[PDB]
């Protein structure tokens, strides 16, 4: 219903150690930096870019530890105080309850891929219907050409 609470990415409640990723371009672009509204490091999480439209092998993983309801997600690019250009034009959500068995989130219609950002600055809020029940959430940047992506995220929902 109305459980759109920030789960801890910008606030710091989800600590650094709980945020992992496939790869990182630099230490300053590490997974931990992919927190919504953060300007620390080089401004976001950036993998050893670019993301290949055919091989979507890159991801940002958040470990929530307990089982949550994820009703909404929020994404941003690498604003880096107006000097950054990068963002994910699209992404897909993968999720696990045990960290072993991964489920691709799919809309009521059946589409996997969600529309991402249009710039590195503005937060884009994408609702999740059906809502996700997970302990682990993965954000996979999705593209149409080999482009450099960067992300800052936030998960919204409540605990079980």
């Amino acid at each position: 219903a109305i459980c759109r609470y920030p789960l801890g990415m910008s606030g710091g409640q989800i600590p650094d150690e709980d945020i992992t990723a496939s790869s990182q371009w630099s230490e300053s672009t590490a997974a931990k930096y992919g927190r919504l509204d953060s300007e620390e490091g080089d401004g976001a999480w950036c993998p050893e870019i670019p993301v290949e439209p055919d091989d979507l092998k890159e991801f940002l993983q958040i470990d929530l530890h307990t089982l949550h309801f994820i009703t909404l997600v929020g994404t941003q690019g690498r604003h880096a105080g107006g000097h950054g250009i990068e963002f994910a034009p699209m992404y897909k959500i993968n999720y696990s309850r045990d960290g072993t068995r991964w489920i691709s989130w799919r809309n009521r219609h059946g589409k996997q891929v969600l529309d991402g950002n249009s710039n590195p600055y503005d937060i884009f809020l994408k609702d999740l219907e059906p809502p996700i029940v997970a302990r682990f959430v993965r954000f996979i940047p999705v593209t149409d050409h080999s482009m450099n992506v960067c992300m800052r995220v936030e998960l919204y929902g409540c605990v079980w």
Epitope: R78, G82, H83, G84, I85, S118, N119, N148
Partner: nanobody, 112 residues
């Protein structure tokens, strides 16, 4: 290095258009006296335009390719908008660690 111009004194509620010329990634920044440089707006290169929450709706950015100059129409100007305005080229992470050399920036005073 880019050069900004077109500033001056304006009454609250007023309007002003700033100019900039010497480069796809391009941004508008301002320095209020006693404050650090902050982002105001940027035009990417499907040309995507974005504005700081503090200037959303009130300000507009547009790139001229017949004059190789980017403009910033600042409508409904309030006191808070008093600063020295600048423009600089945006960079990819691959160029993030390269020094920034700013250039000329015009004074904009929004007083009654």
């Amino acid at each position: 290095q880019l050069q900004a111009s077109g500033g001056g004194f304006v009454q609250p509620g007023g309007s002003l258009r700033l100019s900039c010329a010497a480069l796809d990634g391009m941004g508008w920044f301002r320095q209020a006296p006693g404050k650090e440089r902050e982002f105001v707006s940027a035009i990417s290169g499907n040309y995507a335009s974005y504005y700081a929450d503090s200037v959303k709706g009130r300000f507009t950015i547009s790139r001229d390719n017949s004059k190789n100059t980017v403009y910033l129409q600042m409508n409904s100007l309030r006191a808070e908008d008093t600063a020295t305005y600048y423009c600089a080229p945006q960079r990819s992470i691959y160029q993030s660690h390269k020094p920034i050399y700013w250039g000329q920036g015009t004074q904009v005073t929004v007083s009654s």
